[PDB]
């Protein structure tokens with residue numbers, strides 16, 4: 001089974017993907033997480049990608065497509081979390097899979113209002129070591145654990161990231177709808193309720 005998680009930043013896609021991957025045996029492919037590792041490691045990808053990420057812009061398609069080609073799991077179930085984010089990326093993904101006799105099975109759209117997106121991103125805190133995600137209100141970190149606020153989770157960059165999502169990523173809703181594979185998730189609900197919906201639409 002191959003899944004794509006689609007939706008605005010802050011929708012809870014990473015949180016749901018981690019849970020589903022651990023519980024149902026999926027390889028979790030997060031372009032965000034992989035890019036962050038590349039930036040930390042100072043690879044050619046990381047050095048190039050950094051500028052776009054810091055401004056809240058998408059990293060150029062060719063870089064992302066190459067990345068996916070390099071990490072795509074041979075066999076087994078896969079969650080693409082936050083990829084594709086553009087029509088060109090989605091077209092490349094479909095071509096990739098076709099050559100392997102595979103296809104995307106379901107695309108889950110994590111629907112959530114802008115007001116909630118902004119609350120989620122502004123309260124988002126991460127363990128910079130482990131990548132573990134918390135929220136100051138909805139899932140506070142333990143006192144013993146060091147966390148930071150991502151620089152791209154500041155108001156100005158959040159605004160840009162949301163605009164970028166609406167312009168470049170939201171057209172993927174119709175792209176996948178017309179393939180007959182889109183499923184709607186009310187991503188505004190609490191974590192456990194969202195997870196129940198996720199489990200529902202893939203069974």
Ligand SMILES: Nc1ncnc2c1ncn2[C@@H]1O[C@H](COP(=O)(O)OP(=O)(O)O)[C@@H](O)[C@H]1O
Nearest residue numbers: 010011012013014015120124134135138190191
């Ligand atoms: N259903 C939810 N309700 C409230 N907060 C959530 C929910 N899902 C995730 N969060 C919190 O919202 C923020 C965004 O979650 P995340 O999984 O990083 O979203 P995405 O990967 O879509 O950007 C995080 O701080 C996380 O702790």
Ligand SMILES: Nc1ncnc2c1ncn2[C@@H]1O[C@H](COP(=O)(O)OP(=O)(O)O)[C@@H](O)[C@H]1O
Nearest residue numbers: 009031032033052053057058059064082083085
């Ligand atoms: N599929 C992709 N295509 C282009 N850029 C990407 C992609 N995935 C991640 N990025 C870049 O990485 C940044 C951070 O992504 P991520 O860690 O997923 O944060 P969020 O969950 O808030 O979107 C994005 O704002 C963008 O610059």
